[PDB]
Paper text:
β-glucosidases (Bgls, β-d-glucopyranoside glucohydrolases, E.C. 3.2.1.21) cleave β-1,4-glycosidic bonds in disaccharides or glucose-substituted polysaccharides, thereby releasing non-reducing terminal glucosyl residues. Bgl proteins have a TIM-barrel fold. The substrate-binding pocket can be divided into the glycone, aglycone, and gatekeeper regions; in addition, the bound sugar substrate is cleaved via a retention mechanism using two glutamate residues. Four loops are present above the Bgl substrate-binding pocket, forming a large cavity for the nascent substrate to access.
Two different space groups of TsaBgl crystals containing triclinic P1 and orthorhombic P212121 were obtained at pH 7.5 and 8.0, respectively. Two TsaBgl-P1 structures were processed up to 1.9 and 2.1 Å, with Rwork/Rfree of 0.1694/0.1952 and 0.1599/0.2019, respectively. The electron density maps of TsaBgl-P1 and TsaBgl-P212121 structures were clearly observed, except for the partially disordered electron density maps between the Gly302 and Gly304 residues in TsaBgl-P1 (chain C and D for Data I and II, respectively). Particularly, the L3 loop exhibited two structurally distinct conformations, one where it was oriented towards the substrate-binding pocket (folded L3 loop) and the other where it was oriented towards the solvent direction, i.e., away from the substrate-binding site (straight L3 loop). Particularly, as both the folded and straight L3 loop conformations were observed within a single crystal in Data I and II, this indicated that the two conformations can appear in the same environment. In the P1 and P212121 crystals, the L3 loop regions of the TsaBgl-Data I (folded L3 loop conformation) and TsaBgl-Data III (straight L3 loop conformation) chain A molecules, which showed the most significant differences in L3 loop conformation, were carefully analyzed. In the top view of the TsaBgl substrate-binding site, the L3 loop in the folded conformation induced a greater narrowing of the substrate-binding pocket than the straight L3 loop and exhibited a relatively negatively charged surface. The substrate accessible width of the substrate-binding pocket entrance with the folded L3 loop conformation was approximately 30 Å, and the proximate distance between the L2 and L3 loops was approximately 5 Å. A Tris molecule was shown to act as an inhibitor of TsaBgl β-glucosidase activity. This molecule was found to bind to all the active sites in the TsaBgl glycone region.
Residue numbers in the entry: 1 to 444
The structure:
Amino acid sequence: MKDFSKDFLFGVATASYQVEGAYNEDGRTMSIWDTFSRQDGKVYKSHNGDVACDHYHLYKDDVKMMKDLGIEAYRFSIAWPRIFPAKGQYNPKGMDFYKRLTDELLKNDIKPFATIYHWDLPQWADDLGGWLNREIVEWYGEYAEKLFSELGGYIKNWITLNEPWCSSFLSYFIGEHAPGHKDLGEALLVSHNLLLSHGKAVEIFRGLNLDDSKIGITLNLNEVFPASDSDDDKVAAQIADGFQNRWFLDPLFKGKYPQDMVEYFGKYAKVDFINDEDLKLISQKLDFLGVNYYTRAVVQKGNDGLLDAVQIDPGNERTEMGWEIYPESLYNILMRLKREYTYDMPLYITENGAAFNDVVEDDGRVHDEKRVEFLKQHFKEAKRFLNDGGNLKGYFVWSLMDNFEWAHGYSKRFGIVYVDYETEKRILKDSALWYKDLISTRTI
Ligand code: NA
Ligand code: NA
Ligand code: NA
Ligand code: NA
């Protein structure tokens, strides 16, 4: 008796700038993250993705390695600067990489899940205003249309955006991510144009009416807990919950922004970008929702720079990201989606994983037993979601390999495969051998 059906998709995930390297090869021009990584201090130790895992050149080895683990699906992102290295200038050599990547995946019985935008905005777009310029909806739409036309016969599962909360608030309000602005109003406008650009891609995708092809979006979601039962900490929790989750779930699945947060933000910045026609485009019916889950947040009243809510450390074990290990929130979020937002729509966990201080032993092994226990605990919550009626179609572990972890550089290792960057050698961690066995047995 299987806990994961034979139809269930055990997968792994990467992103273009985090793994590909070859940053100026075959016509690729800079993205906002190439630029950001060269701004003094914006990436830890001045790391960048010039070479990364060199997946652009080693992809056939990497696909073979995934075949040998039993991987059934592979979530990757397509680099906009490879496809349109300048405004209105298509680059066939960039497309060619994703066609030969896709061909290798299909020959190895691996189902491709393609993320259209995973933060590597072309620099030419940002120089015109980027996500602050409403015309990006058209530039993104033409970019998406080109991918559907050239790849839609071979890629059948499409994700418009990865984690728009990061591309908006983390990039334009907190400023940790490219382009690194620090203005709440800009972040709110960016979040709207991201969602509107998502709606343009869905509209284009529906018009093409490709056989057996599905489209969705990926959101990073948490569960917010008040530090105490006080009314003040409950209000702080509502703010944090709207900031992370409801600000994107409500427009996508209810067709409106959460009104409490519209009022809250409106005390501090402009919210005049809201209108009915935009929200109708944003709330188009999707085929699935991809969920990125890593941790919960415990919040108390206060204001330390961001909004009127301060996250605290509750004192439990954390990963090397400083993120609390809290698997139960994976079930709570998935059930919350089923009850309040997505109903019986298919759901995918498009990222879950952990960063630990991995070391290669004298015999060539990586005994990452903390990551094994992390993945076991979270797959058990996915199993419990399926047992309680949830429509979970797949689970993509982040990540296939250690890679460039954005503002942390290479200092944080998420992979089930260890990468020695000096030699680009791949080393299977014990978590990879455990995942191979889980795929074979499908019971946990
Ligand atoms: Na790269
Ligand atoms: Na750099
Ligand atoms: Na991706
Ligand atoms: Na939908």
